[PDB]
Write a protein that binds this ligand. Sequence first.
Ligand code: HEM
Ligand code: HEM
Ligand SMILES: CCc1cc(CNC)cc(OCc2ccc3ccc(N)nc3c2)c1
Ligand SMILES: CCc1cc(CNC)cc(OCc2ccc3ccc(N)nc3c2)c1
Ligand SMILES: C[C@H](O)[C@H](O)[C@H]1CNc2nc(N)[nH]c(=O)c2N1
Ligand SMILES: C[C@H](O)[C@H](O)[C@H]1CNc2nc(N)[nH]c(=O)c2N1
Ligand SMILES: [Ca+2]
Ligand SMILES: [Cl-]
Ligand SMILES: [Cl-]
Ligand SMILES: [Gd]
Ligand SMILES: [Gd]
Ligand SMILES: [Zn+2]
Lengths: 402, 404
Amino acid sequence: KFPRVKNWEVGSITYDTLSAQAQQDGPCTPRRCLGSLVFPAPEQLLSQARDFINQYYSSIKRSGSQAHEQRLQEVEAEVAATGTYQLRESELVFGAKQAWRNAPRCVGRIQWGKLQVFDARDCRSAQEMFTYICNHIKYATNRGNLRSAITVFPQRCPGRGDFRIWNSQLVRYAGYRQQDGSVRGDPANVEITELCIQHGWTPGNGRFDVLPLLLQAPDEPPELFLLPPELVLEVPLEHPTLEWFAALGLRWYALPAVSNMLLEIGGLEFPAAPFSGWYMSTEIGTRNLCDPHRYNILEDVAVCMDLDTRTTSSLWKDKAAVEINVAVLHSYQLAKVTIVDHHAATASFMKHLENEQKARGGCPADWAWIVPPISGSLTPVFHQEMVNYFLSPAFRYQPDPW
Amino acid sequence: FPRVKNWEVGSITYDTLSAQAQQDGPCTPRRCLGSLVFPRKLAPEQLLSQARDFINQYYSSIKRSGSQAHEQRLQEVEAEVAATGTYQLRESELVFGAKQAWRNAPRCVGRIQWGKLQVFDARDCRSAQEMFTYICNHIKYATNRGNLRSAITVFPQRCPGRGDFRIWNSQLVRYAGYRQQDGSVRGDPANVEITELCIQHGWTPGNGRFDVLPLLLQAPDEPPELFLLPPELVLEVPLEHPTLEWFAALGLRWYALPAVSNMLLEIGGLEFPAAPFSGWYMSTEIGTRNLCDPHRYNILEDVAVCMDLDTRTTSSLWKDKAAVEINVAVLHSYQLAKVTIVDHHAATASFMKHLENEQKARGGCPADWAWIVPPISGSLTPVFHQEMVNYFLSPAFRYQPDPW
Ligand code: HEM
Ligand code: HEM
Ligand SMILES: CCc1cc(CNC)cc(OCc2ccc3ccc(N)nc3c2)c1
Ligand SMILES: CCc1cc(CNC)cc(OCc2ccc3ccc(N)nc3c2)c1
Ligand SMILES: C[C@H](O)[C@H](O)[C@H]1CNc2nc(N)[nH]c(=O)c2N1
Ligand SMILES: C[C@H](O)[C@H](O)[C@H]1CNc2nc(N)[nH]c(=O)c2N1
Ligand SMILES: [Ca+2]
Ligand SMILES: [Cl-]
Ligand SMILES: [Cl-]
Ligand SMILES: [Gd]
Ligand SMILES: [Gd]
Ligand SMILES: [Zn+2]
């Protein structure tokens, strides 16, 4: 009674036994599917914790040992005394990797095991926070040869407030409101931009102005931190065979570093644990630039391409979109900044589902997020059925601290 | 009442229609299965409840609920089912039901047209030769010299004991798929099996990669029988690209009328195992899925070479380049040949329009996100940024076991 999953390009069939362990509940019932929605005490902490420890002890093939029982006894004894507990460092490393491994909407998961984990749980202020962050950015960027990294700030704990990073990503561009009621820069970041300003940031007026950090120490207002310019590797965008493209003045940044997600390991919550890998060209090419509610350059590129934008059947949108993606790939290659196209990405994800079926008897996957936003059926994930479910450890969304 | 958002505009709606969904789907709180093609798998007290529910909403949609013919029609069905164990549908009901089934089909992106559907009543059919005639009139009417018109043909309902009417082809028009000493395929690999059956039932096989299959039509109990389609009834379109002159030389063609002949029409509790419906192609169906899928015509790399693309690195986006041009060739050829066709952009926008219509009228619309979003340029179409609720309403089209 495990979901039969087919690959339609090949003919292969597997059953997802791993789904039957899903440690949390989703938005769907047999009445109605909601898969397409973006946003779907002590003893209960003990049962999550006990579950994680079992996981950790399985992965180090010391399952059901002395050190395993002792560790359970340790944890329940500490939840007694303090109403919480502390992860050992190896447990944290494993927990951070599993969280990525379990992230259903991530197409880059072939890499899950190669994650660099920086432990900043000793962190003290917004100031020490800023430094750890700059170091994350420095290590992960690595002069354009990107490394996967995660910095883990102190856990949610009884008595103190949370560390929070107010910014959605470590590097993001300003979005300013206007006289036309419109936005200059990235419309997705108008709110946080408003917040930065009113917290003492002297704004600019470009379309690619990098935002300051708003960092929050427990029980403090947020504190504004300017990123040292030379720490933010950017990539000016140019097209390999369309020379007017460089005159669009478009740029994107090297490091995709998501900074507003919560990391959950064994019932413990880390509201601040920014992570980063490297871009798939489509996030920038199609989503960041061509979404109407974003930079929305599609028509502008299409006109310049001298496509016929009168009628849809000329497929001007598709033609413009493909060139913008080529431009992004080319520019990142010219600059020696790591980048993966959607065909390479989805192909390593197939390898991933295959590694995962042998290893854990399945792989939690969100089809609508895994299939790229152009060339969908041109990639192998489109033809693959997938089971979506929530495993812990995990990254979760959390509400904006403001 | 699920909250549903559109991220392009920011707007919010509540799907209240979802609440009235009965026949449970595949998903549970613990695991989503929306991405699966065939959800899970494939004493007549039940027939009545399905029947009364269908009749009620029939009369709802003409205001005539409460008093009048409404009460009256409830007992006739009661009587009929009490008497016979089944019931016949009034011709208006049949029309209403066929229309609703199209309206409820969450995977269909062209439902904005659901009101303009021609129902050919063929319940008074008792022969395979007869079906063939019905199927032929459908094809003629639907095709209409390339000015396509949605039509369905409804054959007799399934009866307790004794057989079924059934079209063994998945569609009325399908190309041949021939195996060999390679295991590879000349023609369409999706139709390999039904080409096996066609041949084993007497059909004299053909040249190769665009031979229209013959039909395999099955009247109740008595075994299936082959019927050759009159070549003047099968409108086709040779594929030519507007500016890439060599494209025609590739000798690609595709047919005109997409006509699904294996799905099961279910109205008011009654099951119609044979109800061939048809409409017109959205371009990507042919351009992207049919010609470019690795397990279909798989032509993508071939077009790429001719375009002299760098097939040596995936990051050249050669696949993406080839696929657009193939799609442009499809739309161009269909237009030149004056055959109704719709591009993915136009279609999706009309589906957004359909969604807002369906919000005001029924309080929502069942939509299968993964099937509504086109197979290329997804995030470039408005449906991509629209959240969708997927659920099952009756009347419906349902998939059904094949007759083997
Ligand atoms: C190194 C190469 C990586 C690639 C190519 C990649 C690719 C992607 C893409 C394209 C998405 C969809 C995001 C969107 O459409 O906005 C995604 C989602 C996600 N990724 Fe990865 N990623 C990488 C690294 C990582 C790392 C290092 C982590 C964590 C340690 C991670 C965790 C996640 C999570 C939690 C999501 C879902 C986020 C959400 O639902 O908003 N990824 N990934
Ligand atoms: C007239 C214009 C129409 C357009 C442009 C259109 C387009 C589409 C598309 C793109 C799909 C996705 C399925 C696939 O690509 O394989 C689909 C599915 C479907 N359509 Fe429509 N369609 C039209 C008319 C109709 C009509 C007239 C009916 C019934 C009378 C219908 C019933 C269905 C059903 C039941 C499905 C689900 C198919 C399946 O899951 O096997 N459609 N349609
Ligand atoms: C609304 C939630 C959301 C939206 C969007 C973009 N919407 C236009 C992106 C979201 O996640 C964005 C994300 C997360 C993790 C990543 C890891 C690596 C990588 N290269 N990109 C990522 C990108 C979440
Ligand atoms: C297997 C279920 C399935 C497969 C496939 C193709 N697989 C490569 C198509 C399916 O639906 C195919 C379909 C059904 C109804 C349509 C109505 C109108 C139209 N233009 N196209 C349709 C196309 C169902
Ligand atoms: C409404 C829809 O679910 C939403 O736009 C999703 C669809 N799939 C996606 N897939 C990825 N990878 N990223 C996204 O932002 C989205 N957006
Ligand atoms: C596995 C996946 O759900 C499957 O390939 C679906 C995806 N979306 C689709 N959408 C349409 N319109 N037609 C299809 O055949 C499919 N295939
Ligand atoms: Ca060459
Ligand atoms: Cl981004
Ligand atoms: Cl088809
Ligand atoms: Gd040029
Ligand atoms: Gd040449
Ligand atoms: Zn679901």
